[PDB]
């Protein structure tokens, strides 16, 4: 089925993503029609909390970032505690132990289906250009495959 | 249908592969149980013969290299005319036009499904570490997608 196909691609991307970056967690954060996000796929190293299946109602995508991510925005943050983020935002990440994150979009037929997100837990991390490129290309490959499958 | 889904992934791999490398041709070369290979997808620049839909039986794989390719072996050849190859080997490449090539494995369910292959047709080409890494990861990503899709 279409949804099973999407899930197979998502599970592939999180597994290869974590292997590529050797980070602590990679997820696909998939959007519903209102851009409420569900963690539909996760690859996480041993010992860290499992975000899989969590529903996170974060309004900043619907309200602020849908267009930029459709246009290919990438956001990389070395230390989430030194990024001017509000407590409301931090409280979404604290239970998952996020200290640094890297966000690339999954754009399928010009629509934002979700985000592929890497986490470094309890440890700041300066994401390097080549890591960002490889992570972005992974998301692009998965998105293009889904475009062609249906 | 596995066959239709297969082609969708292969078309993404060859198109993205040739864009990444800016080379003359990228193909998927898939093995059967005799380890005879068939070119099942191709992206090729203008002016070069279309290698698509060629069955090419090369015994060196089954006789020497299948297990090595399963374990991540590649072939990076800067100039095929300086590799001391036999007339049999040159003969099978002559209709396609191959001056340099990069061969990376596609491993699915711990079996060698085939090879993702890049050709430069009219000049030597020293393949760079970043290119080999990107091309290998493209093949690995596509292989894992197929592994999880069905
Ligand atoms: C925008 C925003 N949210 C997220 C969310 C996540 N990062 C992750 O790693 C995960 C998985 C655990 C999620 C989910 C990101 C990365 C961003 C930044 C987008 C970008 O800059 O490209 C955002 N959301 C909030 C929440 C806050 N604002 C509210 O109105 C309410 C209510 C909130 C609490 C839930 C904030 C502060 C931001 C950043 C500020 C902004 O860009 O508007
Ligand atoms: C091994 C060998 N064959 C190939 C084949 C290809 N290169 C390409 O670009 C394509 C797509 C058009 C194909 C197909 C490669 C890359 C390699 C090297 C493998 C490796 O070392 O990793 C090989 N095959 C032959 C052919 C020759 N030997 C025979 O017994 C008969 C019959 C032949 C004619 C068909 C040769 C000489 C080699 C190299 C020597 C070896 O590895 O055994
Ligand atoms: Mg189907
Ligand atoms: Mg690597
Ligand atoms: Mg489509
Ligand atoms: Mg399978």
Author numbering:
A (entry chain B), B (entry chain A): 435 to 584
Lines from the paper:
In our experiment, the temperature of a cryopreserved crystal was raised from 100 to 150 K, and a complete X-ray diffraction dataset of dark-adapted Pb was collected. As prior data with other CBCRs demonstrated that full photoconversion requires temperatures above 200 K, we anticipated that the blue light would generate one or more primary photoproducts and not drive rupture of the C494–C10 thioether linkage nor the complete transition to Pg. Indeed, comparisons of diffraction datasets collected at 150 K from a single TePixJ(GAF) crystal as Pb and then after irradiation with intense blue light clearly manifested structural changes at and around the chromophore. Isomorphous difference map peaks were highly localized to the D pyrrole ring for both units A and B. In fact, Fo(illuminated) − Fo(dark) maps around the D ring and the N535 side chain indicated electron density differences in excess of ±10 rmsd, which were consistent with structural changes in the bonds associated with C15 as PVB transitions toward Pg. Taken together, it appears that blue-light excitation at 150 K allowed isomerization of the chromophore within its binding pocket at the C15 methine bridge, and relaxation of N535 into a new orientation. Interestingly, the Fo − Fo difference peaks implied that PVB swings deeply into the binding pocket during the initial stages of photoconversion as compared with prior Pb and Pg models. The electron density differences revealed that PVB moves away from N535 after illumination, and now is in a better position to interact with the D492 and Q526 side chains, which move slightly to accommodate the new chromophore position. The binding-pocket side chains on helix α4 also adjusted slightly to the photoproduct, based on small difference peaks at Q526, H523, and C522.
Of interest was PixJ from the thermophilic cyanobacterium Thermosynechococcus elongatus (Te), which transitions almost completely between blue light-absorbing Pb and green light-absorbing Pg end states using a phycoviolobilin (PVB) chromophore. In addition to the conventional thioether linkage that connects C522 within the GAF domain to the C31 carbon of the A pyrrole ethylidene side chain, PVB is attached via a second thioether linkage between C494 of the GAF domain and the C10 carbon between the B and C pyrrole rings. The end result is conversion of C10 from sp2 to sp3 hybridization, which shortens the π-conjugation system of PVB and induces the substantial hypsochromic shift from green- to blue-light absorption. Comparisons implied that photoconversion involves isomerization at the C15=C16 bond, a rupture of the C494–C10 thioether linkage, restoration of the π-conjugation between the B and C pyrrole rings, rotation and translation of the bilin in the GAF pocket, and conformational rearrangements of the protein backbone and surrounding amino acid side chains.
